[PDB]
Amino acid sequence: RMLFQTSYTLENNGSVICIPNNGQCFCLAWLKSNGTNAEKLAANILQWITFALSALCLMFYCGWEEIYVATIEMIKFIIEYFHEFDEPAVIYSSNGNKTVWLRYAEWLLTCPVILIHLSNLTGLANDYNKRTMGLLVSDIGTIVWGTTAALSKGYVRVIFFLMGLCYGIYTFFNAAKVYIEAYHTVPKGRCRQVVTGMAWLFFVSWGMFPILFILGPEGFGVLSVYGSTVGHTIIDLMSKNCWGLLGHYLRVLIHEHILIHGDIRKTTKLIEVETLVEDE
């Protein structure tokens, strides 16, 4: 069923593998199961769901960040639906790895844009500062190292994962300051509840990715690839759809505030944050 060699004969009491000279690549590790049909189904359902609300979110939705990830997201399901396990949505490499490049490519496409969104939670500003650049670079870095880790094996996989981890820690800390700052920047009411919710959504969801990597085929293989897919789809849901929804909601709330009360700032000490207020 694959576009690589899946059919083969064992010869010489299993010491030889004979293959059609058909120009197809071959490897046993590639034929290993992606997981149970139940996990498969759980995976396909969740994908349809995230596709469904990515479409719903897109229908419903500058605010460009979230339409951008929703566009990437439903683009990705289009690929998943038709080619999820075709090279190179999955990369079957010469070391036997199956690396879900669809996932890592998606992260590359969406994470910086989420971080850009995070860097401007209010949506008001020509915000972007040095912090934001660090957020972006550290995060692209973690994805590159993680992807490299996924593509690797043994010690070097460990090294790259650890490099990704160091970049990730840097990203989380940076994101945290941003969330802390945003909390004190936005109006005292509901806006601070959703910033808080976004922080939670963000750190749990984003923190789950290295956990999933550790658990997945790229790690200690406690999760099958379907299992990994299931997990990733849940935290995709959280990190892309739910977070972006809150983020959109936060922005609507800020705008409505800005519209009704004007844009009024009172300096608060943390670095200094220009807090939104209702009155003079």
Ligand X SMILES: *C/C=C(C)/C=C/C=C(C)/C=C/C1=C(C)CCCC1(C)C
Ligand Y SMILES: CCCCCCCC/C=C\CCCCCCCC(=O)O
> Nearest distance from residue 150's CB to a second copy, in Å?
9
**Does residue 180 interact with ligand Y by CB under 6 A?**
no
β-strand pairing of 272-277 with 264-269: antiparallel
Question: Considering only CA atoms, which of 94, 2, 80 is closest in space to residue 40?
Answer: 80
230 binds, among a second copy, ligand X, ligand Y, none (CB under 5 to 8 A by kind): ligand Y
In angstroms, the CA 162 to CA 157 distance is 8
Among the listed residues 187, 210, 227, 247, the single contact to ligand X using CB under 6 A: 210
* Residue 110 touches ligand X, criterion: CB under 6 A: yes
Q: Does 267 bind a second copy (CB under 8 A)?
A: no
Question: Is residue 197 close enough to count as binding ligand Y by CB under 6 A?
Answer: no
For 240, list phi and psi in degrees, rounded to 5: -105, -50
Residue 127 engages ligand Y in binding (rule: CB under 6 A): no
Residues 221-260 that bind ligand X (CB under 6 A): 236, 239-240
The binder of 277, among ligand Y, a second copy, ligand X, none, by C-beta within 5 to 8 A per type, is none
Instruction: List, in sequence order, every residue forming a beta bridge with 277; answer none if it has no partner.
Output: 264
Asked whether 142 and 159 are in contact (CB, 8 A), the reply is no
Establish how many alpha carbons lie within 13 A of residue 138's alpha carbon, considering only the half-sphere containing its beta carbon: 19
Q: Sketch the per residue contact string, 2 through 41, with ligand Y: x for CB under 6 A, - otherwise.
A: -------------------------------------x--
Helix (H) or strand (E) holding 265: strand 264-269
Residues within window 251-280 making contact with ligand Y, judged by CB under 6 A: none
Token pair for residue 264? 């009024």
Report, in Å, the least distance between residue 210 CB and ligand X.
4
C-alpha torsion 257→263→266→269, nearest 10? 80
126, 154, 155, 260: residue in contact with a second copy (rule CB under 8 A)? 126
Q: Which two tokens stand for residue 208?
A: 């789950």
CB atoms within 10 A of CB 276: 22
Among 53, 182, 235, 276, binds ligand Y (CB under 6 A): 235
Q: What is the largest CA-CA distance in the chain?
A: 88
Q: Is 185 in the site for a second copy (CB under 8 A)?
A: no
Q: Which is nearer to a second copy, 33 or 129 (CB)?
A: 129
Chain residues binding ligand X by CB under 6 A are 107, 110-111, 114, 142-143, 145-146, 149, 161, 164-165, 168, 206, 209-210, 213, 236, 239-240
